[PDB]
Amino acid sequence: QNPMRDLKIEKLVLNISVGESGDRLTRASKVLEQLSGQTPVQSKARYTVRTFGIRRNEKIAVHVTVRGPKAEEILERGLKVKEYQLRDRNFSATGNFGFGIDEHIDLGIKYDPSIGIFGMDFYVVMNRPGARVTRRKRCKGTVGNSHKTTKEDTVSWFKQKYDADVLDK
Amino acid sequence: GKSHGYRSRTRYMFQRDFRKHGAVHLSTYLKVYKVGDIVDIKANGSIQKGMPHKFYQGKTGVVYNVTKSSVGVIINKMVGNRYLEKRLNLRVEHIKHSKCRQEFLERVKANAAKRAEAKAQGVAVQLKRQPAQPRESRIVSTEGNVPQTLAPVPYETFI
Amino acid sequence: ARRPARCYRYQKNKPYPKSRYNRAVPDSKIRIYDLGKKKATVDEFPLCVHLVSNELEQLSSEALEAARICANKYMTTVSGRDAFHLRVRVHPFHVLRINKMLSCAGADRLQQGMRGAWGKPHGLAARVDIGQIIFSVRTKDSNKDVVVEGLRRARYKFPGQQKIILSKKWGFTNLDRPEYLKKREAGEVKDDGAFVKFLSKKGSLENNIREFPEYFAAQA
Amino acid sequence: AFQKDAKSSAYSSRFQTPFRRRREGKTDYYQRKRLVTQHKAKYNTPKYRLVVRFTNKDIICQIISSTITGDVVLAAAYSHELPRYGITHGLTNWAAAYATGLLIARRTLQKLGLDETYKGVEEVEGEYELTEAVEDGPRPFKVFLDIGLQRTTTGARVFGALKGASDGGLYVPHSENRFPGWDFETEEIDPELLRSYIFGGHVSQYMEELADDDEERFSELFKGYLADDIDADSLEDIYTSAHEAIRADPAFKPTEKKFTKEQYAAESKKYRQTKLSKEERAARVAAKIAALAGQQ
RNA sequence: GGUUGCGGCCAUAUCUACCAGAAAGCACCGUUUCCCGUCCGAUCAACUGUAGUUAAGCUGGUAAGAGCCUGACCGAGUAGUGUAGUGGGUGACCAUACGCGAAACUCAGGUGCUGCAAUCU
RNA sequence: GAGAACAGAAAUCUCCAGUAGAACAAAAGGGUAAAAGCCCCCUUGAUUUUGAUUUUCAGUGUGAAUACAAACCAUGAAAGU
RNA sequence: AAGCUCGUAUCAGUUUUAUGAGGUAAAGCGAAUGAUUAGAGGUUCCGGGGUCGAAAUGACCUUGACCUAUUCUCAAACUUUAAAUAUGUAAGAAGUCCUUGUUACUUAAUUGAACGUGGACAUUUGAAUGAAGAGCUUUUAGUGGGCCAUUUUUGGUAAGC
RNA sequence: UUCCUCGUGGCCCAAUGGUCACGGCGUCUGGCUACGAACCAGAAGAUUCCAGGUUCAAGUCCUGGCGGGGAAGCCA
């Protein structure tokens, strides 16, 4: 009973939350640019804390979205790092997952000492076909419960490909 | 110390009729107002332009002018020992026709029809409105509906 | 300090409660409103004796506390702590004011008399109507003569006239005594903490059964 | 599948529903008011709007006025009717939008009586121009574009239909800054590019480009053209002949209905579900109480 | 009768959980040369009805469903109120006379109707 | 609420719910959800002329506001504002 | 006070019929905002304190909030609801209907809007009761310290306040 | 009772709304001294009287309470 109730990768978000702005953040932008092939986007701070040393609208972090074959490619080459081993958490109740890595030279990227070393947060968000019903302008609707993405279904999918597992409880 | 502004004492007046907020329906805007037409004034708090003063809430006037978005209404306001003629310029969101006049005009058509019918079939029009008259001599019947006798009841607390 | 209660007996002013406009009020003397075997199933105590006002007036927090204490002590002395559930079915929310003129020698250090006479909070009072229930008890049917005397002794600590009526209906609930017995035998009742939940004919049948397995079960 | 949500009785009690068309997601009443509200000093002059809508596999252009009872249609034109003018394939494209605009224009103008005058552009070269008013004669029919919830972008087929209606004879007020060929850095329209977008220049150019870049695609797409013996350069002639036929006779011959209304209704009622009654509900409840807790 | 576009009244139309949907139409769906817009062809834009599906949306049905609507000698002629008295009462307040008259509670029923145009085994 | 390395009660990213429980310079009240709010684009109608009307009211003044007229402009595909 | 124009016109400190508006009293708060009494059941890795534990998204108790269903009592500056009294308009001759003219306004349009010609409908001519006349103008005096009673109501313990 | 003012490390005192806060004394450590003071070097010590709100940020800005001090209380 899966003609079109199949589970595909909606998108993969690569996030790098540098604590503050400057050449560090330009180097992170170069990282994500040379990684994906897209131009990243620099995200600002909402409010001020000072225990972290940030103030409003300081351009604190960067991120980029990837969709399709490029996304699954980046996923597998960055999940070989995690050894195809993930937790039973790291999986949301909405059928999405994610994992953080350090030292992104683990993914086939040469050092380029002008750039340095940066960690990353991968977050993969899923959807069945027919997600346009929520994201479109006209006749914007909601998705049926039979069609929703679940932790269980996402886990079964993540097992039935990559031949991976759900270690750590 | 005191406060006597335009929208003073207008909390509940221009409050917005529970579960009927926002987005006034368009029959409001498609209605048609000719000169010499009777209109009741009922403000809308969602439309702040063209409002009436609170005095004219619930008042009823006659149209004297019609414009792009508004109509002009003649009201009569009591000031001392005279009535003064007041001319408001109100947007149509704050306005609606009078079913009273609509009913009177229906009654006019009916009176004309009855008069023509009586001219055709026999005079004795008799087409005024009389008040509720006293009721004539009826005869009830018992027929199973026997009189059920009642009595007062004593004091009980049931607390 | 604390001028008498004849100055504040009657409902002369509108209700003036503690709010964002009237802050800075004192705290009520009465804080305990339910005492006795409060953790008692409804089947333990069928009787009930209400203390009911016949006058429209105000009652001080002070008087409510005094009456509570007198009643409770008579109960605990005669029948024990676990023979009654006294409930105070009226709450002091109405704030009473003083203007507080000077009494030492108010000739020159005047307070300007009735100028700026709006008063500061003096105390609290409960606003009471005719027929309004005060001081319910819910005992067993064998402690009637004890609770009636307790309430009669409490009745001296209130102004007005406060009569004592012997109620029906398992008196912290509604539902007259035979009707409650019909429901209790037909299994239309679940015992919540100190009070009952009833079976209706409106809800979803799944949860109605999973809350009331008994009602139409052929076993019972 | 999540019961932490739990819309409570209070929420449901003081929830205000939007208008039905807003719940659906089909009408912006802000736009509707500011498009339908008429100058009250005209008193019954209907404000005519050209509603252009794009489903998948169909364009819908219809002329509409408003009333307290409901909107009222003066004329309508659909793209599934273009086959009688000689357009079988690509009938949701920019060119079919142009043709549908021309069709609804000439259809209205015919049934209204103005078609002899205000014949619009019969020498289409993609030039910005509005239907001027004939002195010593009536004024042109005025009608305002209702897009709806569609986004305004330059190069779009709502504006193709608008261009077609304006060239067909209706006075459709518009600027030229959302047609294709609008140079952005310097504000000037490109009529040769616009004429290509009318006569399928971008479609035919893509076909030619796939005829030497990749033919597998060209085969899976564009299959109807290969079936119907169509190459790239026939497309301009096709659309030109179609425009000429539309200007010749737009009078809307409808279809034959082939097992008509009552047959249709019976066939539909065969599969539609009737509701229930109170006796049936009580019976269902009785059975459910005898089943669930009865345990046989 | 179903569906689409545009609507009127704006929950008898919403919400929660399940079950069906023939034909047609919507819809999801396929692609990125051009117009166009994005961190991203997801949205928006354009091109194909071609590669496929009714899974979802949508439509309807069910639920001693929540909510909403209607009605009633259900509460209740109750509370409250206009008018009256050299009426009762220390008073607080109360009754009576001539009138008007609720809300909650209870019970029962219902759960979108409809206009213009077009199309459909 | 559920999730993602450093990252924790609060940093940035993703999803679900969310009739407003937020924001709209400032009192309080009203009003507002494909908005009147947040972001972006373009702008100066915060222009000109001189009258009428509403409020306060003596039916005077001032202030404030309303709806039109003749122009000139902005914005928008446009209706319109 | 002077009068003027007219002689049932149109009016009225009133009702009725129709149609509006209102947010006080009452009522409600197992309905939003707030205040508020008491128990019941769940919830934590995601509060703290104890027993067993070298530790363990380790086993069990204590209180803490949080959630669900219930329960008692309230609101001048809260409210779904919502009176009585009081209040607006109308009840037609300056009316209704039919034909058709003027325009620089308006319309896609001799379509509308406004004003008209001509014609038809009168003595139940369009509810009640009354009308010691109706309408209009001029000029001028004194007054511009108020007080009491019923009822509504603010301050104040209250007051012949 | 009205008004004015102040509340800061054990003590005294200051602060631009812009670093979980300057000085001086006391305390502590070490060193000079046979020893203690004095001196030389260095350290620790703060929930800015309490409760709220404004602002990105309050010691500071706004309201109330608590304590200390001061002025006022006249005509008869």
Swiss-Prot record, chain A:
InterPro entries: Ribosomal_uL5, Ribosomal_uL5_C, Ribosomal_uL5_CS, Ribosomal_uL5_dom_sf, Ribosomal_uL5_N
Localisation per UniProt entry: Cytoplasm; Nucleus
Cross-referenced Gene3D superfamilies: 3.30.1440.10
One Pfam family named in its UniProt record: Ribosomal_L5_C
Keyword rRNA-binding appears in the UniProt entry: yes
GO molecular function per UniProt: RNA binding; rRNA binding; structural constituent of ribosome
Keyword Calcium: no
Superkingdom assignment: Eukaryota
Processing and modification events after translation: N-terminally acetylated by acetyltransferase NatA.
Keywords: Acetylation, Cytoplasm, Methylation, Nucleus, Ribonucleoprotein, Ribosomal protein, RNA-binding, rRNA-binding
PROSITE patterns the record matches: RIBOSOMAL_L5
Listed GO CC annotations: cytosol; cytosolic large ribosomal subunit; nucleus
Residue positions where N6,N6,N6-trimethyllysine is found in the record: 70
Main location: cytoplasm
Gene Ontology process terms (BP): cytoplasmic translation; ribosomal large subunit assembly; translation
PANTHER family associated with the record: 60S RIBOSOMAL PROTEIN L11-RELATED
Function: Component of the ribosome, a large ribonucleoprotein complex responsible for the synthesis of proteins in the cell. The small ribosomal subunit (SSU) binds messenger RNAs (mRNAs) and translates the encoded message by selecting cognate aminoacyl-transfer RNA (tRNA) molecules. The large subunit (LSU) contains the ribosomal catalytic site termed the peptidyl transferase center (PTC), which catalyzes the formation of peptide bonds, thereby polymerizing the amino acids delivered by tRNAs into a polypeptide chain.
Other comments on record: Present with 21200 molecules/cell in log phase SD medium. There are 2 genes for uL5 in yeast.
Family: Belongs to the universal ribosomal protein uL5 family.
Protein name, as recorded: Large ribosomal subunit protein uL5B
Swiss-Prot record, chain B:
PROSITE patterns according to UniProt: RIBOSOMAL_L21E
UniProt subcellular location: Cytoplasm
InterPro entries: Ribosomal_eL21 (IPR001147), Ribosomal_eL21_CS (IPR018259), Ribosomal_eL21_sf (IPR036948), Translation_prot_SH3-like_sf (IPR008991)
Short name of one Pfam family: Ribosomal_L21e
Assigned GO CC terms: cytosol; cytosolic large ribosomal subunit
Any one Gene Ontology BP term: cytoplasmic translation
Function according to Swiss-Prot or TrEMBL: Component of the ribosome, a large ribonucleoprotein complex responsible for the synthesis of proteins in the cell. The small ribosomal subunit (SSU) binds messenger RNAs (mRNAs) and translates the encoded message by selecting cognate aminoacyl-transfer RNA (tRNA) molecules. The large subunit (LSU) contains the ribosomal catalytic site termed the peptidyl transferase center (PTC), which catalyzes the formation of peptide bonds, thereby polymerizing the amino acids delivered by tRNAs into a polypeptide chain.
Binding partners and assembly: Component of the large ribosomal subunit (LSU). Mature yeast ribosomes consist of a small (40S) and a large (60S) subunit. The 40S small subunit contains 1 molecule of ribosomal RNA (18S rRNA) and 33 different proteins (encoded by 57 genes). The large 60S subunit contains 3 rRNA molecules (25S, 5.8S and 5S rRNA) and 46 different proteins (encoded by 81 genes).
Protein's recorded name: Large ribosomal subunit protein eL21A
Organism: Saccharomyces cerevisiae (strain ATCC 204508 / S288c)
Gene: RPL21A
From Swiss-Prot, chain C:
Gene3D superfamilies, A to Z: 3.30.60.300, Ribosomal protein L10e/L16 (3.90.1170.10)
Region (2 X 15-17 AA approximate repeats): 166-215
Glycyl lysine isopeptide (Lys-Gly) (interchain with G-Cter in ubiquitin) cross-link site: 39, 100
CC per GO annotation: cytoplasm; cytosol; cytosolic large ribosomal subunit
Segment forming the signal sequence: none
A single BP term in Gene Ontology: translation
One GO MF term attached to the UniProt entry: structural constituent of ribosome
Sites bearing Phosphoserine, chain numbering: 142, 204
Subcellular location per the Swiss-Prot or TrEMBL entry: Cytoplasm
UniProt repeat feature Sequence, residue ranges: 166-180, 199-215
Disulfide bonds: none
Keyword terms: Cytoplasm, Isopeptide bond, Phosphoprotein, Repeat, Ribonucleoprotein, Ribosomal protein, Ubl conjugation
InterPro entries membership: Ribosomal_uL16, Ribosomal_uL16_CS_euk_arc, Ribosomal_uL16_dom, Ribosomal_uL16_euk_arch, Ribosomal_uL16_sf
Subunit-level organization: Component of the large ribosomal subunit (LSU). Mature yeast ribosomes consist of a small (40S) and a large (60S) subunit. The 40S small subunit contains 1 molecule of ribosomal RNA (18S rRNA) and 33 different proteins (encoded by 57 genes). The large 60S subunit contains 3 rRNA molecules (25S, 5.8S and 5S rRNA) and 46 different proteins (encoded by 81 genes).
Sequence similarity: Belongs to the universal ribosomal protein uL16 family.
Protein name: Large ribosomal subunit protein uL16
Gene from which this protein is expressed: RPL10
Swiss-Prot record, chain D:
Modified sites of kind Phosphoserine: 166, 175, 234
Keyword Chloroplast in annotation: no
Record bears the keyword Cell inner membrane: no
Keyword vocabulary terms for this entry: Cytoplasm, Isopeptide bond, Nucleus, Phosphoprotein, Ribonucleoprotein, Ribosomal protein, RNA-binding, rRNA-binding, Ubl conjugation
Subcellular location: Cytoplasm; Nucleus
Family from the record: Belongs to the universal ribosomal protein uL18 family.
Record's subunit section: Component of the large ribosomal subunit (LSU). Mature yeast ribosomes consist of a small (40S) and a large (60S) subunit. The 40S small subunit contains 1 molecule of ribosomal RNA (18S rRNA) and 33 different proteins (encoded by 57 genes). The large 60S subunit contains 3 rRNA molecules (25S, 5.8S and 5S rRNA) and 46 different proteins (encoded by 81 genes). Component of a hexameric 5S RNP precursor complex, composed of 5S RNA, RRS1, RPF2, RPL5, RPL11A/RPL11B and SYO1; this complex acts as a precursor for ribosome assembly.
Name of the protein: Large ribosomal subunit protein uL18
Gene label: RPL5
